[PDB]
Amino acid sequence: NLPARICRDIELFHFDIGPFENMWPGIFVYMIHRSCGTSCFELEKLCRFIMSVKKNYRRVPYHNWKHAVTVAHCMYAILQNNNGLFTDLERKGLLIACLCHDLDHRGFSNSYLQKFDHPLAALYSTSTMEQHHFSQTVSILQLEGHNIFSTLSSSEYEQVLEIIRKAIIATDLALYFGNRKQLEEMYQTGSLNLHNQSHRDRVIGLMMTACDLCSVTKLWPVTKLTANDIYAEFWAEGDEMKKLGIQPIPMMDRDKRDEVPQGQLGFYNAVAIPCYTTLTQILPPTEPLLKACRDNLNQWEKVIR
Ligand SMILES: COc1cc2ncnc(N3CC[C@@H](Oc4cnc5ccccc5n4)C3)c2cc1OC
Numbered sequence: 001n002l003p004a005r006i007c008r009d010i011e012l013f014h015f016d017i018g019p020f021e022n023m024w025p026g027i028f029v030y031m032i033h034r035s036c037g038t039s040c041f042e043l044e045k046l047c048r049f050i051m052s053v054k055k056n057y058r059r060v061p062y063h064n065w066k067h068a069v070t071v072a073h074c075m076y077a078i079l080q081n082n083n084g085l086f087t088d089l090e091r092k093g094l095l096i097a098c099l100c101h102d103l104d105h106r107g108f109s110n111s112y113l114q115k116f117d118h119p120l121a122a123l124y125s126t127s128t129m130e131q132h133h134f135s136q137t138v139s140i141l142q143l144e145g146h147n148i149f150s151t152l153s154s155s156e157y158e159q160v161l162e163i164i165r166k167a168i169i170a171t172d173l174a175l176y177f178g179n180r181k182q183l184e185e186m187y188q189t190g191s192l193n194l195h196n197q198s199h200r201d202r203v204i205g206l207m208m209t210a211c212d213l214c215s216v217t218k219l220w221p222v223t224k225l226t227a228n229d230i231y232a233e234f235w236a237e238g239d240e241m242k243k244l245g246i247q248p249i250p251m252m253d254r255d256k257r258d259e260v261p262q263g264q265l266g267f268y269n270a271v272a273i274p275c276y277t278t279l280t281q282i283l284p285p286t287e288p289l290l291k292a293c294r295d296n297l298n299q300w301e302k303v304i305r
């Protein structure tokens with residue numbers, strides 16, 4: 001049961017889940033119980049499911065089990081501050097999707113799997129790792145004693161698996177540019193309709209981006225330390241590009257590590273700032289995510305000065 005500090009701070013968008021792994025299942029149970037009532041799930045089955053999810057994340061620098069529970073926490077905070085917009089089934093699907101959305105990641109991009117000619121890239125030619133993450137989730141749910149949705153009707157099971165598949169695939173950041181461009185146009189023409197399932201699927205895709213990127217919405221010491229882990233994987237991938245005989249892009253080239261601050265400025269301006277600006281226009285109570293992101297941009301601008 002939750003320590004008082006955590007019961008309080010868990011409600012902040014910039015909560016950090018701490019270094020005790022064994023506290024994370026209970027943090028996730030607490031969130032999904034607070035969002036979806038306690039009858040939502042059988043505690044034993046859900047416990048079994050969380051441990052199996054944990055076991056199928058790898059010990060890589062950034063796309064690991066801590067990233068998964070962090071992305072789930074950001075979704076919890078968005079859903080808690082947007083009471084009555086999403087259904088109980090959407091709330092449960094989206095927290096499950098976040099916990100599962102990088103299952104079995106090895107720390108390499110879809111672009112590297114494609115250049116390597118990995119077998120996953122023949123199986124899933126677009127959104128390769130994300131199609132795999134969703135495949136892993138379904139395989140885990142299919143293990144004995146792991147069907148945390150066994151009390152739903154067949155129709156509601158199929159519906160929640162669809163909420164989860166679309167939410168996982170939307171974490172392919174290649175898809176975010178076009179999604180956010182469509183949402184911005186809907187917002188500005190006043191045509192966005194949350195009753196329209198295609199529009200609602202877009203807003204959930206943007207939620208998934210905002211949660212996947214949320215290191216840039218923590219406080220600066222967290223954001224800066226997290227950036228170490230993000231570059232650790234990118235530089236490992238850049239080494240592997242070099243070994244295939246392909247010069248990596250600068251972000252993946254550890255010899256270009258002095259240009260980190262400039263690369264962060266690029267990212268914030270092209271991706272994170274527009275992402276949280278669009279999200280705040282659609283869901284005004286997400287505004288703290290945007291304010292934290294602007295503060296971090298100003299920190300990277302300070303490092304440059
Ligand atoms: C907080 O630091 C982060 C966090 C990430 N989380 C998840 N995926 C990331 N990437 C996926 C492929 C890449 O995608 C892209 C897409 N578009 C751009 C535009 C301008 C600069 C960089 C851009 N990168 C980079 C980053 C990248 C990053 O900073 C350099």
Ligand SMILES: [Mg+2]
Nearest residue numbers: 101102171172
């Ligand atoms: Mg991912």
Ligand SMILES: [Zn+2]
Nearest residue numbers: 101102171212
């Ligand atoms: Zn992720």
